[PDB]
Design a protein around this ligand. Structure first.
Ligand SMILES: Nc1ncnc2c1ncn2[C@@H]1O[C@H](COP(=O)(O)OP(=O)(O)O)[C@@H](O)[C@H]1O
Ligand SMILES: [Mg+2]
Ligand SMILES: [Mg+2]
Length: 411
């Protein structure tokens, strides 16, 4: 058993090597720790896709508005510490190991899972920091996610589509019911998904939550160079085109206006203008245009394909791909194949990672490589200045490339 002085790596290894579902055990330990209400105001964000960027937008705006903000996020690209941000920054590794020692002693003989530990740890780090606002990204689903032991002041649903069907149900209706579990009596329930499953309205009714959905209570319009927003409180014009998916920026703005937090129009403009997340349609360079997007399911791949198609009339689209078997590979590739010209396949290490050959079988074309790095090198060697190189398929794939680019800065 590690201690507060142990290196973080020893903690994570200990946490990775570990019954009765339901939030009881995690709730009982959280009660002993007094972290059930991490800040005076909490936003909890659920959804199939766009949770991370909706959270980032909220954080950007609130920081410009002068609030002390904490953000819980998952998963992480490279380092575990990316998961807990305070004022947009990561916390010392020793802060994380101390919180782990605190949870370890507080749990007594109560057993916790990896995500339960990390969630309690984030709640603890936030409490210690004395913040005004805490933004929690749900780990998986809603009703049964560790983040649901906290009662959100504003609950958010970014989108609903298919992913984690093994846990959440086989359809949008069953998935929507689970995600909506984060709703609360008399609290705004912000739904940014344009085709809302009825089960979300059912759950809002069962709880007495205040449902405010895109297309009904609020809406937005776009232009080639800006956008406008509207809700029951009025409208906003000439907003900055976002650097995160357009639907998520509107969702965050809706949740923000519904919170009653005092935020000026200028703090809104500044926050929307600077909100961006590595690996979420990130334009890394030009000539050739390089893009990183961790789209790992059919709904996100369809969104990426729409973005790809909106790009200027180009040359060729080369793609560097690595995927995990626990995702709908065939479904994801079907969409991507509609815009990709040349495929460069690589394996992902471990148990759940697919081999280059497995991806290739789905593609029907392309070259296989020994690693993501070699695939990346090959794509960049072949790419012309008028082309676009896309690194996609998983967080692991985008991370492998960011790390190689970084290490080379040192050569
Ligand atoms: N509203 C959305 N609709 C469709 N796909 C989306 C949306 N938001 C994000 N995505 C896709 O999901 C990927 C990851 O998004 P992310 O912001 O990390 O959301 P999440 O935290 O729920 O995974 C993006 O890189 C993009 O491919
Ligand atoms: Mg996420
Ligand atoms: Mg997920």
């Amino acid at each position: 058993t590690p201690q507060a002085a142990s290196p973080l790596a020893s903690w994570l290894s200990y946490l990775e090597n570990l019954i009765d579902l339901g939030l009881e055990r995690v709730s009982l330990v959280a009660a002993r720790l007094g972290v059930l209400k991490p800040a005076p105001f909490v936003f909890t964000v659920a959804g199939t896709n766009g949770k991370g960027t909706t959270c980032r937008t909220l954080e950007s705006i609130l920081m410009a508005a002068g609030y002390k903000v904490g953000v819980y996020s998952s998963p992480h690209l490279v380092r575990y510490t990316e998961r807990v941000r305070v004022q947009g920054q990561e916390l010392p590794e020793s802060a994380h190991t101390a919180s782990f020692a605190e949870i370890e002693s507080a749990r007594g003989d109560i057993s916790l899972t990896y995500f339960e530990y990390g969630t309690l740890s984030a709640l603890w780090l936030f409490k210690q920091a004395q913040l005004d606002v805490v933004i929690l990204e749900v780990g998986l689903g809603g009703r049964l996610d560790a983040t649901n032991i906290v009662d959100a002041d504003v609950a958010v649903v970014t989108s609903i589509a298919l992913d984690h069907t093994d846990w959440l149900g086989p359809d949008r209706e069953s998935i929507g019911r689970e995600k909506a579990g984060i709703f609360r009596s008399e609290k705004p329930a912000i739904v940014g998904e344009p085709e809302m499953p009825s089960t979300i309205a059912d759950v809002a009714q069962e709880k007495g939550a205040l449902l405010q959905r895109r297309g009904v209570e609020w809406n937005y319009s776009v232009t080639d160079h800006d956008w406008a927003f509207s809700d029951a409180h009025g409208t906003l014009e000439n907003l900055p085109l976002p650097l995160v998916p357009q639907p998520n920026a509107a969702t965050a703005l809706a949740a923000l206006r519904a919170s009653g937090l005092e935020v000026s129009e200028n703090a809104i403009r500044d926050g929307i203008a600077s909100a961006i997340l590595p690996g979420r349609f990130q334009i890394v360079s030009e000539s050739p245009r390089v893009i990183f997007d961790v789209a790992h399911n059919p709904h996100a791949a369809e969104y990426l394909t729409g973005r790809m198609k909106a790009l200027p009339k180009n040359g060729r689209v080369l793609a560097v791909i690595g995927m995990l078997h626990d995702k709908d590979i065939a479904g994801t590739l079907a969409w991507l194949k509609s815009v990709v010209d040349d495929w460069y396949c690589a394996p992902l290490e471990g148990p759940r990672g697919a081999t280059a050959e497995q991806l290739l079988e789905h593609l029907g074309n392309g070259k296989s490589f020994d690693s993501v790095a070699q695939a990346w090198d090959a794509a960049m060697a072949d790419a012309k200045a008028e082309d676009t190189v896309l690194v996609c398929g998983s967080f692991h794939t985008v991370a492998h490339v960011m790390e190689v680019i970084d290490a080379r800065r040192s050569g």
